[PDB]
Structures are given as structure tokens and as C-alpha cells.
Amino acid sequence: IRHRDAIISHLNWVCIFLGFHSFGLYIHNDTMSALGRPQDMFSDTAIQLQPVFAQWIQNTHFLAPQLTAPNALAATSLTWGGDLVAVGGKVAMMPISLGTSDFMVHH
Amino acid sequence: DIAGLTPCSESKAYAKLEKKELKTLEKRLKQYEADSAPAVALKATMERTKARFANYAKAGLLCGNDGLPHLIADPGLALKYGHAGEVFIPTFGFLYVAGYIGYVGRQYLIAVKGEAKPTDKEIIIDVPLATKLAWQGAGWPLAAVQELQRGTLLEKEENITVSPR
Amino acid sequence: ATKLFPKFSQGLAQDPTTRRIWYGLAMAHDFESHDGMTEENLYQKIFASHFGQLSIIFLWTSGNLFHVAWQGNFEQWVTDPVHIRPIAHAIWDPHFGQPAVEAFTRGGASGPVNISTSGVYQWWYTIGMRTNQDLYVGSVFLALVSAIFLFAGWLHLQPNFQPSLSWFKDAESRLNHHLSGLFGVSSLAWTGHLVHVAIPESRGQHVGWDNFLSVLPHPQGLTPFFTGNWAAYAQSPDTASHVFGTAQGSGQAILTFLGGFHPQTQSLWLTDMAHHHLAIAVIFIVAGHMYRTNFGIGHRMQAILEAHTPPSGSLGAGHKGLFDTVNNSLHFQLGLALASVGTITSLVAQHMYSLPPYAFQAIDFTTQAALYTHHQYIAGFIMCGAFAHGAIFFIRDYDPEQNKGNVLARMLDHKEALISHLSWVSLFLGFHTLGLYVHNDVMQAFGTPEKQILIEPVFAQWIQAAHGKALYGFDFLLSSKTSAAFANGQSLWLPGWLDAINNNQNSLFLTIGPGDFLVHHAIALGLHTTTLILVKGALDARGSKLMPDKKDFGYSFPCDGPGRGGTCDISAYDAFYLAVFWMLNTIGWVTFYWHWKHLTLWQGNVAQFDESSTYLMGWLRDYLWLNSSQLINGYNPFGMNSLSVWAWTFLFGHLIYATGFMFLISWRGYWQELIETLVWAHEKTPLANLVYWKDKPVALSIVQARLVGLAHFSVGYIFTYAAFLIASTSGRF
Amino acid sequence: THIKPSAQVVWPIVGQEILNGDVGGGFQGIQITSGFFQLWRASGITSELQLYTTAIGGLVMAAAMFFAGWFHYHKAAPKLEWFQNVESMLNHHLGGLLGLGSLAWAG
Amino acid sequence: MKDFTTYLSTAPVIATIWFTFTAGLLIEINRYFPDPLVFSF
Amino acid sequence: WTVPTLNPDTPSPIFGGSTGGLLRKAQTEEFYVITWEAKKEQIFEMPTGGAAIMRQGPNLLKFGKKEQCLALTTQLRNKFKLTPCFYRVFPDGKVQYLHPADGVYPEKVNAGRVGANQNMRRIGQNVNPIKVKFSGRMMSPAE
Amino acid sequence: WLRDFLWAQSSQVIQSYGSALSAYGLIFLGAHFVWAFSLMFLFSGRGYWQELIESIVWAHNKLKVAPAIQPRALSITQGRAVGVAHYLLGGIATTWSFFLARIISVG
Numbered sequence A: 001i002r003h004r005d006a007i008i009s010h011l012n013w014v015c016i017f018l019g020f021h022s023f024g025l026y027i028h029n030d031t032m033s034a035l036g037r038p039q040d041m042f043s044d045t046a047i048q049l050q051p052v053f054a055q056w057i058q059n060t061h062f063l064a065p066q067l068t069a070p071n072a073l074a075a076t077s078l079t080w081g082g083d084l085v086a087v088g089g090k091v092a093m094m095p096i097s098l099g100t101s102d103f104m105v106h107h
Numbered sequence B: 001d002i003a004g005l006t007p008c009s010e011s012k013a014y015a016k017l018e019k020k021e022l023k024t025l026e027k028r029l030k031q032y033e034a035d036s037a038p039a040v041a042l043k044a045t046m047e048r049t050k051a052r053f054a055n056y057a058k059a060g061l062l063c064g065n066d067g068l069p070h071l072i073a074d075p076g077l078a079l080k081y082g083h084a085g086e087v088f089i090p091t092f093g094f095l096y097v098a099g100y101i102g103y104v105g106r107q108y109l110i111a112v113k114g115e116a117k118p119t120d121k122e123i124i125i126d127v128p129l130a131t132k133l134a135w136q137g138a139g140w141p142l143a144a145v146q147e148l149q150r151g152t153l154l155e156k157e158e159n160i161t162v163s164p165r
Numbered sequence C: 001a002t003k004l005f006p007k008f009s010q011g012l013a014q015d016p017t018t019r020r021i022w023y024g025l026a027m028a029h030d031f032e033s034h035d036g037m038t039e040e041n042l043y044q045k046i047f048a049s050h051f052g053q054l055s056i057i058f059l060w061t062s063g064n065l066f067h068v069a070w071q072g073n074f075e076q077w078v079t080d081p082v083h084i085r086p087i088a089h090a091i092w093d094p095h096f097g098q099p100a101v102e103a104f105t106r107g108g109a110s111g112p113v114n115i116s117t118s119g120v121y122q123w124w125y126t127i128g129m130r131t132n133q134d135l136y137v138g139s140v141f142l143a144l145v146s147a148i149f150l151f152a153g154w155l156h157l158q159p160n161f162q163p164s165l166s167w168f169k170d171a172e173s174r175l176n177h178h179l180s181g182l183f184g185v186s187s188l189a190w191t192g193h194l195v196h197v198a199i200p201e202s203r204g205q206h207v208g209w210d211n212f213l214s215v216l217p218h219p220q221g222l223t224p225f226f227t228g229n230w231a232a233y234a235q236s237p238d239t240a241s242h243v244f245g246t247a248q249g250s251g252q253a254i255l256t257f258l259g260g261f262h263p264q265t266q267s268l269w270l271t272d273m274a275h276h277h278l279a280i281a282v283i284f285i286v287a288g289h290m291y292r293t294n295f296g297i298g299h300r301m302q303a304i305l306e307a308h309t310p311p312s313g314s315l316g317a318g319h320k321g322l323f324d325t326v327n328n329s330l331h332f333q334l335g336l337a338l339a340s341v342g343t344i345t346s347l348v349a350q351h352m353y354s355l356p357p358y359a360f361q362a363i364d365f366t367t368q369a370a371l372y373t374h375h376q377y378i379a380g381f382i383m384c385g386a387f388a389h390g391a392i393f394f395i396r397d398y399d400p401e402q403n404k405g406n407v408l409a410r411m412l413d414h415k416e417a418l419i420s421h422l423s424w425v426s427l428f429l430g431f432h433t434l435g436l437y438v439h440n441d442v443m444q445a446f447g448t449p450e451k452q453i454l455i456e457p458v459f460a461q462w463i464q465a466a467h468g469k470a471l472y473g474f475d476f477l478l479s480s481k482t483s484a485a486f487a488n489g490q491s492l493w494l495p496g497w498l499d500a501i502n503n504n505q506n507s508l509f510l511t512i513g514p515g516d517f518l519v520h521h522a523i524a525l526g527l528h529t530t531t532l533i534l535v536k537g538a539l540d541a542r543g544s545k546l547m548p549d550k551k552d553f554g555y556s557f558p559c560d561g562p563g564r565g566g567t568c569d570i571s572a573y574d575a576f577y578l579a580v581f582w583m584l585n586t587i588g589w590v591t592f593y594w595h596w597k598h599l600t601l602w603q604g605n606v607a608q609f610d611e612s613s614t615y616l617m618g619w620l621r622d623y624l625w626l627n628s629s630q631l632i633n634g635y636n637p638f639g640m641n642s643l644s645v646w647a648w649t650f651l652f653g654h655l656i657y658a659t660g661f662m663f664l665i666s667w668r669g670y671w672q673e674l675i676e677t678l679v680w681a682h683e684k685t686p687l688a689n690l691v692y693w694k695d696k697p698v699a700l701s702i703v704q705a706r707l708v709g710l711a712h713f714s715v716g717y718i719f720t721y722a723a724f725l726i727a728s729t730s731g732r733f
Numbered sequence D: 001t002h003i004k005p006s007a008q009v010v011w012p013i014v015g016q017e018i019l020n021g022d023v024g025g026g027f028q029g030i031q032i033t034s035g036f037f038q039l040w041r042a043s044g045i046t047s048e049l050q051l052y053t054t055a056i057g058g059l060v061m062a063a064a065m066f067f068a069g070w071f072h073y074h075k076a077a078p079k080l081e082w083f084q085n086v087e088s089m090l091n092h093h094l095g096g097l098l099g100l101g102s103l104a105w106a107g
Numbered sequence E: 001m002k003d004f005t006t007y008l009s010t011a012p013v014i015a016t017i018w019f020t021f022t023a024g025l026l027i028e029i030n031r032y033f034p035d036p037l038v039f040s041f
Numbered sequence F: 001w002t003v004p005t006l007n008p009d010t011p012s013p014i015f016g017g018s019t020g021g022l023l024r025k026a027q028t029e030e031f032y033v034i035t036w037e038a039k040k041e042q043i044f045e046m047p048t049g050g051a052a053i054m055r056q057g058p059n060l061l062k063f064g065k066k067e068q069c070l071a072l073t074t075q076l077r078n079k080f081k082l083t084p085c086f087y088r089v090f091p092d093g094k095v096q097y098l099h100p101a102d103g104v105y106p107e108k109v110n111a112g113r114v115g116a117n118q119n120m121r122r123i124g125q126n127v128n129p130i131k132v133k134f135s136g137r138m139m140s141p142a143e
Numbered sequence G: 001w002l003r004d005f006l007w008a009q010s011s012q013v014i015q016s017y018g019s020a021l022s023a024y025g026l027i028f029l030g031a032h033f034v035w036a037f038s039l040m041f042l043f044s045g046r047g048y049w050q051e052l053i054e055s056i057v058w059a060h061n062k063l064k065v066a067p068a069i070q071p072r073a074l075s076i077t078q079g080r081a082v083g084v085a086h087y088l089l090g091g092i093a094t095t096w097s098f099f100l101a102r103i104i105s106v107g
């Protein structure tokens, strides 16, 4: 309670920073694709913001039964990667890739 | 033929709509067995549809170019060409009930005004008094016009108004 | 210390905060709340401000003319005006990509351009312009006129020309002159233009400044006029084989009474336009010789008002004391002006689409849509301002003792009845319109479209059949071939009127069904509720039971505190504020109805409206969802087209509207403490406390953020619907 | 894999029998999305009678909980020093509630 | 049970009872007289 | 009673430091000082945030706003039954006494304090705003 | 997100009329109603409604039907609570209808 001003000030600043650098990315892409400049967007093709940390964690949990969980026959989820499980023709669960769109929406 | 409308008894889009709805229901029906609960339900729904269309066409309704029945709100056009039971008669059928509700509420309020704690007879309904008034308020037009003719329906200007009146 | 910006308010100039800037931006034109303002100085500053508004308007028209003449294709549009698009101006956007330049290259241009939806092409082509030089010259002339008005505004601020207060309060001569010269002689000169220039240019003959003293408007010049043989001017009208702009089936008449539409433009004839403005000119000039001036004859308006007291005082003291009430009140006159102007703007909208005046209009669908939506939203805003200034009158200018017993005090005496009856009408209309719409929705949902409450609007259909629309068969007045109203006008307007009203390809008295019924009752709901809010704010502007001393706080004050249960949005300003929402909704309903009825007419699919408009999922899907298909695909990950600007603008309005939600829902006190924290953060941050504010950061005030949320809301509403309209109409057509 | 899970039947009163959709298994009802069928298959139900008796047991336990509230307010209500034994409450909610509950569910 | 019947006389319980009765009456009317669009009988 | 002079030798309560304290308004425009004599050491609540320990005897405390000083005043008067009195200090050293401006607290009479801003009419006996129009500045009919 | 999510995946909820999922479309439209209805309470303030209410109470007094329990406008806090309640209800229920109508059909 004695330094709530520091707390809320830094929280305000990070909210503003994140609002800008998370929504203005969407506005930038809207402006670029509306102006006909898809090479200037924030996409998996033009300007990649790849979520490399989550991708590394996906690969770290996919390769987990081989090294870091030897008694596990498979990974906890198929979302880390690998083969899909399809039941009745429908996909039950399959790997989930993450790219620039996922970066932006996570932020 | 009031506003260019065709009667639903001789409207073609009306019949096409009946056939369309029955075709939908029999399309749902063909996937079920002879005597099952879905089959009986869909058969009952088909019969309800047929009866509904027959009863609307029998009641002399007017259908548009879409085949849907169009109501006639004008008295004089409804009373002349036999469409009074569409908007005009249900008008008074509503107003009787609505003024009945309002008059029972008014009578209950006026009745509980005189008590010691009148507000507690509004969160806690005096169901004896309420039922008595709800039964004896069926003559609300006569009693209302008699309260109007005596001048005891409207409050005088003891009403709480504002500084610039 | 004390600042300098609010020269008009010393209380604001001493404000150490950022509220000074905003409130000085928003009190600049409230001249009667200025420091050291007198009534005469008020009227004089208003005179000069009106001169400035005139100059700005004329510069605006000059700029439209200039850009159409320069970056437009007017000389090309007059050749093929049903297939060439109107160019508003060119685009130089350094942010464009190559696809955007490839995409906005429309209408036969060499670069990116904006397709005009303002209808100025059709108007200028109708009134006689065929050349870019004509529009260039008109722009020069209107800029010179704007210069003249600006100089006059400076001039009538000078000591020896500063008008007196009584000269402004002189109403009889202002009315006489503004009725004869400003209205009737202006119509006379417009008839002169039509007859001399517009009609012959429509008949192929070029009539410009260089030859209008050398050619005649009629083969028998002025002999028919000075000898009373005025029918000779209706001798040879334009035939039905006439094509506009050339002399094929031209005709020689200049003042006809044909009625209806030109068959090739689907617009009004210029000849009965000339006769129109001539009759209007005569009527307005005879009307302008009514009130008393320096010549001994006329009326004194005070006498007409004071004599108009009915016996039995059913109106009280009648209109006794109202002349000094209107004359000495600028908000009363402003409210009357805004009422009349908004009502006639609604008239412009409702008539310009059914009786389209300009050639090749009604075939430019986007132009019609933009014009209607435009003038209707303008009318709504103006009509809200009318009641707003009526409230400001009740507060700032109303004298209860000088209006002792007249009609204006009789309004305040029975204000509760007005407000309660308006509330009843709004309540009934909303209950029942929503109930019928939800009923039809549920019937469509349950697969039974035949159980809807479809009420045939037979009153409006009876009116239409009285006008001669034989679709319904009332056979009443003008559809009755064996009637008097039919037999009397048959040598006059009727043939064209009936040929134009029985045609279902024009917007003249469209056929209507139960969807029209339901949406007209929604329109009534919106009107009655908007005027309920506005009338309530005007009448309770001076006092309520929650606040009988409300006049002592002004027009726009935030609140009276949390006491007495809570007094938020209690001012009249806030009543206007809450009414702007209901106005925007009303006009949105109006324009949705117009746009969908006309989108189904133009597509030949009026059955879609007759079926789907009776329930609200029809309005959602088949109107909002269906017609958004090209708009939002204006740009996709595959590319873009010329509708991408309208897509971006669509999302723009969706952003601004929602941003107004921020000022509308969150209120001041969360933000003031937030800004306190940010002040601490700035004062304690190294390398940044070097930089310090001169105006103390405070949150937006209550009234201010109300206005700001309303402005973000209105801008987003307007931009979103404009984008949707122009894109869903330009995408199809 | 073919039949849609449905557990809510609508009465045919004002036309809402159209809401009794063709879900499958010779049934007409509202396709539920709460996942109770999967939960019950995972429990090993395999009979509607077991659901019936589970419902009756749930009603018994509901009446028990309401009797318990009435009891622990009106008949024998604990003191403040009973509620304030947070050590005991945590020990019990961890051993018996979440420990023995998971053990029983494991059984 | 004078107090219990006083409780059942409260505004929300009476409203629940009365609207349950009204809704049931309308429902049974709409069962025994299905799809009443006009006043034909 | 006479106007007391502010003693700068008065100690302050035991506070560990906050962020809700003084800002550049104290250095530029003004700040406020509240004093009180305590009978014991009591942990009170700072209006800026956090709890401080008042000292046995006289205390002194800085604040950037008068509302802070009167908040603590009502807290010390209602919860501790003390009699505090605060000032207004200007950065140039000028001290201006504020709360018990006559010695007694303003809810009690003092038999000699002058009535200011008292309209001797009823609130409905105020004139209409048309009568106070064009009085220079925008003026309420209450004047 | 407009085009390919909120407009594309809305095709199942707005065309659900006449089918088993029509109630989902109904709660789409009604939820859009309730959400916007919340804006009557969030954008506005009590002091307007108290004066409207007292002008209505005048009409009730004139007809001798003014209640003994005096009609007040809702509290300020209550206005904000009602507004946020209707806002959340309408928005969440709109999303609920859209989701379920989409995914019961296409999934």
C-alpha cells in the first residue's frame, strides 16, 4: 500500500506498451493490406514475429519421452508435435503450430 | 382484395409454402421407423401444420405475394370485408383485460392507502383483498366510466408538481 | 500562473490544468458566457461569425467545383452519364502500394481517384454545365464571393459599421427582405438561369455569358409575357423521345406543367422546375411585402401575436409577450431555425429520392443513398440542436414574468402531461414493435412464416391510391378515373404524375407491405422517444423535484452530487446527450429501411424485402450480413480492390464508436487516480523528470468526457454506416 | 462417432418441437455440449439405470446438504475457534478431501 | 404457519405463482387451440 | 486563544517511507503541515498510504493537500480523541494557519466569528438567470 | 477476424432459422438486444430517470394510482451493476449462440 503508485504506474506503462505493440500490429497489418502492401505486414511471410520460445517448449515436450521422461511412451499431448489421432474420421487432436498470428494473439 | 391481396384460400404461394413445410417434415420423417417417438412426433407436427393452414385459409385471411397472411388493422375495411377478428375484435379483447388488470391494481392501491403501514401491503400482498378485487373487477368498464362521470377518477391539483409548475 | 489562451474567460485562463485547453476550445462560441460581453457585442460577433460561415461554405463549394473540374471527368461524364463514374478528386497518398494505385484508378483516370457520391456531377449537368471551364469559372466566382463575405465580416466589425442592437432586433424589415429578396428574387433569378441557360443547354443549345444577350429563351420573346398570353410559354414541351443535352425531340417551351419525370433521365423536367421557381418567386415576393417598414404600410408582428389570444383563454394570455420573448432571445430563434431547417432537410431527403431533380440521378444508386443518408443524419443532428437550444432558452433567456400566462408558460405548467404522454407513446410503440418483430422472428425460427403478425399498412396504401397508385385498388381520388380531382388536372400534371407513380422502377411512392408498417412504427418509436428525451430536458431544464434550482446551475453542469439519491446526467445538456443516441438510432433505422428497400428495388428483388423485413434476422442476415460481403473483402490476404478504403473506414468507425464507449462507461475518478500515479511516475523517473508539464494533467471532466464519448460514438456510427453504404452500393453497382 | 449426445427433450407446445433435432439413435432432442456422455462412458456407466440411481443419490445428498446447513446454523452451530483451525482444515482438505477423494476415484 | 403464509404472500412469491398460473393457462390454451392467429370462432 | 506559531522542532511519526507523499506542488505552490500532541504511541493510518506510528508527545506531519490533513484530523479526532491543528506552508517559508482558525473546531460556535457567503433568502427566492445575464462573467443567480 | 471468423462463421447461426439450431439464432438476436440494452444503463445517469419517473408519477397521481412505495430511479451503483450485467449476459450469450450454432453444424 505504501508503493502502490510504483506498482500501478509500471502496470499502466506495460498495459500501454502491450496495447501498442499488440494491437497496433493488427492496425499496421490492416493499413498495409488495405494500401496493398502485403510485404509490409506482420505475417508469417513478410515480417515474421515467430513465437520461438513456445515453439522450443513444444519441441522440448515432444522430445521429452526420449530423454527427459524415459518411462513415458509418448508425450502428454499431441499438441507438442508428432502424429495426429483421428477417431471416426474426425481429428481428435493434432499438432498445433504457432506463427506470427499466434504471437500477436498471445500478446 | 382489399389492398391488392389475394385470399389465402386461393393464393398459390400459400399452398406452395404449405407443401414446402410438409416436404421438410416428411424429409425428416423418412429417416425414422414406422411407429417410433420421432415418427409420431413428426406426424403430429405435420397434422398441426395442415390444420393450421386449413384454419387460416378458412378464416378468410388475405395473403400477399409471399403467401403469408396479412392482417387488416383498419376498422371499416375490416368490418366491411369480413376481417374484424384479425386486429379489430382482438383490440377490445385486449383492452378489456388490460384495463381489468389496471383497474384491479388501482383498486388495490386505493384500498391499501388507508391502512397503518401501506407500504408493507405492497411488498406483502393482501391476497384476500387482492383476490376479492380481482374477482369483482370484471365490471371495470362500467365502474370506470361511473368513476369518471362522478369526477372521482382523477385527482385534483393536489398533485406534486415542480417549481415552474 | 495566469495563462493567455482563453481570452474570453479569465476563470479558465487561471486554470493550472489541462481543463483550460479543452474548455476554451469548447466555450469559444458561447459568446454570451464570455467575459465582458454585452448584448450588442454578442449580436455583432454573431453577425461576423455568420459572415465567416458563409465564406467557409462558399470556399467549400469552390473547392468541390475546382476538384471536379481539375481531377474529375465532367467533360467525359456528360457524354455517357449512365456508364461513367463521377470522379470527386484525385489521390496522392505516399503510403499507397502499387496495388492500391492500380485499384483506385477508376472512372477513366490516369491515376488513383475517388468516385464521387455527392451528386454534384448530376446537379451541375442539369443546371447547364457541360465544360470543365464552366466549373473552373464557378469556383473562381464562389471563392470571390467567399472573399467578399469575409471582408464584410471584417467590415461590419468596424466602429462606424458595427450595427446597433436594435438593428438586429428589427424583425419586420429583416423578414420582409429575407422573404422577398433572399427567397423570391433569388428564386426569380434561378428561374432566369433555368430558362436562359439550363433549359437550352438541355436542348443542346449552348448558352453562356458570351451569347445569353444574343439568343432568346423562347421563339416569341416576352410578347407572351407583357400581353398576358402566358400559355404560349407552355407551347411545345420536351417530348418523351427527348434525350438530355442534345436537340433530339427538344421542344421550345420553358414553363411547362407536365409533372412526373423526364423519360431518359428519370428526373424532373427543367421546364416545370423553371415554372416552380417562378411561382415560388412571385409567392415569396408577395409574401415579403407583409411586415411594416419605413413606408407606413404593413404588419407589426407584436400586434399579430398580441391579437391572437383566443376567447376562453384556452391558450391563456395567447401569444401576448411572445414578440419580446423571441426577439430578445437568440436561442429561441436558433431553435426555431434549427427545427425548420432540420424539417426541410428531411423534406429534401424524402423528396430528392422519390422526385429526383437532377438528370442521370436515380440511376446513380450510390449517389442517391449517400444523399439521403447524409441529409437525414444532418436533419437529425439539426433537430436535436433545435431542442437543445430550446432548453438553453428556457434556462438563459426565459423570463417567467414577461411570459405570464402565455402559451410558452402554459407549456411549462403542464410539462408533466407532455412528458408522460410522450413516454406512453414511446413505451407503447416500443413494446409493440419489438413484440411483433420478435414474434415474427420466433415464427421464422420455428419454421412457420405464416404465423407472423403481418399488418398491411392500409392507411398509407390508401393515401398512395389517393395519389393515383392503382396497385391496391382503392379507386379513391386520382386512381379513380371518374373523379373530380382526376378530371380537373388531366390537362396538367396528372399524365406525367400517374405515369411516374404507377411505374414501379422509380422511387416515387414505392409499394409497401407489413415490413414497411413495422419499420415505420419503429421510426415513430425513435421520433417520439428522441423528442421525449429532448422535450423532457427542455421543460425540466429549469427545474425538477430532484433539483428545482437547476436554472441556477446553467445548461451544462456535471451533476448535483451523489446526494438526494444521485444526480448523474441531470442537466438538460445531458438530456440532449442521451437523446443524440436515440436520434442516431432513429436515423439508422430510417436509413437502413431506405437502403434495403432500394437495394432490393435496384436488384429487382423487392420480394426479398417484402419477405425478410418483417423479422429482424432478415435485417441482420439478408441486409447487414449479405451486403457486407464485398465491403469486408475490400482487402484480404490475397489482395485488395477499390473498396479497401471503405473497408478500412468501416473498421475505423467500429474503432471510434467503441472508443467512445470508453468515455461513456468509465467515468472520471478511475482516470484521475490513474493520472495521479502517472504524475508520480513522471516526477520520479530519471532523465524524464527533466521534462515537466506546464498544464497539470487531469482527467477529462464529466461533461467533457460525455461530449467526447458522444463524439467518438457519432463519428464511428457515421463513418461505419457511410463506408457500408457506399461500399455495398458501389460494389454491386 | 455417429450419434449426437442429447439429453434435453423439448415439449411440443408452440412450435418448439422443431428444436427436437435429429441427433441420432432414433432420438429427437437438443444436442447437449456439456460432455456428460463422455464423462459417463469414462466412468463406466453403460446403463440408464445407473444414471437414474446416481440421480436419486444426488437428490439424497442434496437433502443431506440442506439438512446439514439447517443443522449447523439452527441446531448446532460451530464457534469461531472451530473455523479458525486452519491447520486442521488444510490437513483434512488435503488428506481426506483431495487425497482420499482421489484415492477413492482411483479405486 | 401464519408467518409462512405471510411469506408466500410476499411480492416475489406471489408474482412467481401468478405468472406460473398465467403462463400455464396460456400454454394450455395454445395446446388445446394450436396456432391462434385470428378470432375466427 | 491566539494563533499558534508552527514549531519546526516538533518530531514526526515513525513512518518507513511511502510513494504517496509530497510532489513538486510542495516545492512550487504549497504544502501543508499538521501537528498534534499524543498521549501514547499508536499506529495510525496515513492518508497517503500505509501505517505510521505516532510518537508520545507532539507530532508533525507533511502533506501536499489540505484534504489529506483534514482526513487525518478527523481520524485522530474520532478514533484517538486528539485535538490536531494544521497549517499551510509555502515554499518560501510562509506559514498560514488553517483549521481551527478561531481556536475551536468549526462545527462549534465561537461567539464572534463572522458569517460569510450567507444568502438571507430562500433557495426558491433566487432570481431567474435572465436577470443576471450580461453581468460580465457567467454568473449564477445566487451571485 | 471480421471476415473469416465473425462473418464467415456466423453463416450457421443466422441461417439456423427453421432448423434445430434456430433457438441459437434467437439467442443470438436476443443477446444482441440485451447487450445493447445494457448501454441504456451504462451511458446514462440516474438523475435523468428520476425526473422522467417523477413526470410519470405525476400521471399516476393524476389517476390516483401512485404507489405507496415511492418509485425511485435505480441507484448509481445499481445502474452500473445492471449495465455491466446486461452487457456481460448479452455478449457472452451472443458468443454462446454463435459458437454452438456454428460448431454443432460444422463439427
Ligand code: CLA
Binding pocket: B097, C431, C432, C434, C435, C436, C438, C439, C442, C451, C452, C453, D014, D015, E026, E029, E030, E034, E035, E036, E037, E038
Ligand atoms: C407484443 C406483441 C405480440 C403480439 C400482438 C402477439 C400475438 C400473438 N402471438 Mg406472439 N410473441 C411475442 C409478441 C407478440 N405476440 C413475443 C415477444 C414472443 C416471443 C416470446 C412471441 C412468441 C409467440 C409464439 C411462440 C407464439 C405466439 C402466438 C401468438 C398468438 C397468441 C394467440 C393466443 O394465445 O390466443 C389466446 C386467446 C385468448 C382469447 C386469450 C386472451 C386472454 C384471456 C384469457 C381472455 C379472457 C377470457 C376469460 C374471461 C378468462 C377467465 C378468467 C380465469 C381467471 C378463469 C397471437 C397472434 C402463438 C401463435 O400461434 O401465434 C399465431 C404462438 O405459438 N407468439
Ligand code: CLA
Binding pocket: A011, A012, A013, A015, A016, A017, A018, A019, A020, A023, A024, A027, C655, C658, C659, C660, C661, C662, C665, C666, C670
Ligand atoms: C476500442 C475501444 C477502446 C480503445 C481503443 C481503448 C483504449 C484504451 N483503454 Mg479503454 N475501455 C474501453 C474501450 C476502449 N479502450 C471500454 C469500452 C471500456 C469499458 C468501460 C474501457 C475501460 C478501460 C479501463 C478501465 C482502462 C482502459 C485502458 C485503456 C488503454 C490501454 C491500451 C493502451 O494504452 O494501448 C495503447 C493505445 C491503444 C492500443 C489504442 C489504439 C491506438 C492505436 C495503436 C493507434 C495509435 C495512433 C497513432 C498515435 C497515430 C495518431 C494519428 C494522428 C493523426 C493523431 C487505452 C487508452 C487502461 C488505461 O488507460 O491504462 C493503461 C485502463 O485502465 N480502458
Ligand code: CLA
Binding pocket: C046, C047, C050, C051, C054, C167, C168, C170, C173, C174, C175, C177, C178, C180, C181, C182, C183, C186
Ligand atoms: C434583399 C436584401 C437582403 C438579402 C439578400 C439578405 C441575405 C442574407 N442575410 Mg440579411 N438582412 C437584410 C436584408 C437582406 N439579407 C436586412 C434588411 C436586415 C436587417 C433588417 C438583415 C439582417 C441580417 C442579419 C442580422 C443576418 C442576415 C443574414 C443573411 C444571410 C442569411 C444566411 C444564408 O446565407 O442563408 C440563405 C439561405 C437560403 C436562401 C436557403 C433557403 C431557401 C430555401 C427555403 C431552401 C430550400 C431550397 C434550396 C435553396 C435548394 C438548394 C439547391 C442547391 C443550390 C444546393 C443572407 C446572405 C445572416 C448572415 O448570414 O449574416 C451574414 C445574418 O446573421 N441578414
Ligand code: CLA
Binding pocket: C025, C026, C027, C028, C029, C030, C031, C334, C338, C381, C382, C383, C384, C385, C386, C388, C389, C392, C555, C556, C573, C576, C711, C715
Ligand atoms: C446554426 C446552428 C447552431 C449554432 C449557431 C449553435 C451555436 C451554439 N450552440 Mg448549439 N447545437 C447545434 C447547432 C448550433 N449551435 C446543433 C445542430 C446541435 C446538436 C448537435 C447543438 C447542440 C448544442 C449543445 C448541446 C450546446 C450547444 C451550445 C452552443 C453554443 C456554443 C457552442 C460551443 O460550445 O462551441 C464549441 C463547440 C465545439 C468545439 C464542438 C465540439 C466538437 C464537435 C462535437 C465536433 C467533433 C467532430 C470531430 C472533430 C470529427 C472528426 C472526424 C475525423 C475522425 C475523421 C452556441 C450558442 C452550447 C451552449 O450554448 O452552452 C450553453 C451547448 O451546451 N449547442
Ligand code: CLA
Binding pocket: C423, C424, C426, C427, C428, C429, C430, C431, C434, C525, C529, C532, C533, C578, C579, C581, C582, G033, G034, G036, G037, G038, G039, G040, G041, G043, G044, G052
Ligand atoms: C437495445 C437497447 C435499448 C433499448 C431496448 C431501449 C429501450 C428504451 N429506452 Mg433507450 N437508450 C439506449 C438503449 C436502449 N433503449 C441507449 C444506448 C441510451 C443512451 C443512454 C438510451 C437512452 C434513453 C433515454 C434517454 C430514454 C430511453 C427510453 C427508453 C424506453 C423507451 C420506451 C419504449 O420503447 O418502451 C418499450 C420497452 C422496451 C422495448 C424494452 C423492454 C423489453 C421487453 C418488452 C420487456 C420484457 C422482456 C421480458 C419479458 C423480461 C425478461 C426479464 C426477466 C424475467 C429475465 C425503453 C425502455 C426513454 C424512456 O424511458 O421513456 C419511457 C427515455 O427517456 N432510452
Ligand code: CLA
Binding pocket: D066, D067, D068, D069, D070, D073, D074
Ligand atoms: C425450512 C426450514 C428453515 C427455516 C424455517 C429457517 C428459518 C430461518 N433461517 Mg435458516 N436455514 C435453513 C432452513 C431453515 N431456516 C437451511 C436449510 C439452511 C441452509 C442453507 C439455513 C441457513 C440459514 C442461514 C445461514 C441463515 C438462516 C436464517 C434464518 C432466519 C430467516 C431466514 C429467511 O429470511 O428466510 C427467507 C429466505 C429464503 C426463502 C431464501 C432461500 C434461499 C435458498 C436456500 C436458495 C434458493 C436459490 C435459488 C435456487 C435461486 C434461483 C434463481 C432464480 C432467479 C430463478 C430464520 C430463523 C438467517 C438468520 O438467522 O438471520 C437472523 C441466516 O443468516 N438460515
Ligand SMILES: CC1=C(/C=C/C(C)=C/C=C/C(C)=C/C=C/C=C(C)/C=C/C=C(C)/C=C/C2=C(C)CCCC2(C)C)C(C)(C)CCC1
Binding pocket: C331, C332, C333, C334, C335, C336, C339, C343, C383, C386, C387, C389, C390, C391, C393, C535, C538
Ligand atoms: C424546445 C423548444 C423549442 C424548440 C422546439 C422544437 C424543436 C419544436 C419542433 C417542432 C416541429 C419539428 C414541428 C413540426 C411540425 C410539423 C407540422 C405542423 C406539419 C404540418 C403538416 C401539414 C399541415 C400538412 C398539410 C398537408 C398535408 C397533410 C399533405 C398535403 C398538403 C397539405 C398542406 C394539405 C423552442 C426553440 C421553440 C423554444 C421553446 C421550446
Ligand SMILES: CC1=C(/C=C/C(C)=C/C=C/C(C)=C/C=C/C=C(C)/C=C/C=C(C)/C=C/C2=C(C)CCCC2(C)C)C(C)(C)CCC1
Binding pocket: D096, D097, D098, D100, D101, D102, D104, D105
Ligand atoms: C469441481 C466442481 C465440480 C465437481 C467436483 C467434483 C466431482 C469433486 C469430487 C470430489 C470427490 C470425488 C471427493 C471425494 C471425497 C471422498 C472422501 C472424502 C472419502 C472418504 C472416505 C473415508 C474417510 C474412509 C475412511 C476409511 C475407511 C472407511 C477405509 C478404512 C480406513 C479409513 C478409516 C481411513 C462440478 C463441475 C460438479 C461443479 C463445479 C465444481
Ligand SMILES: CC1=C(C/C=C(\C)CCC[C@H](C)CCC[C@H](C)CCCC(C)C)C(=O)c2ccccc2C1=O
Binding pocket: E015, G040, G041, G042, G044, G045, G046, G049, G050, G072, G073, G074, G075, G076, G078, G079, G080
Ligand atoms: C433505464 C434506467 C433507469 C430506470 C429503470 C427503472 C427505475 C426500473 C426498471 C424496471 C423496474 C424494476 C420495474 C419493473 C416492475 C417491478 C419489478 C414491479 C413488478 C410489477 C409487475 C411488472 C409484475 C435508472 O434508474 C438508471 C439509474 C442509473 C443509471 C442508469 C439507469 C437506467 O439506464
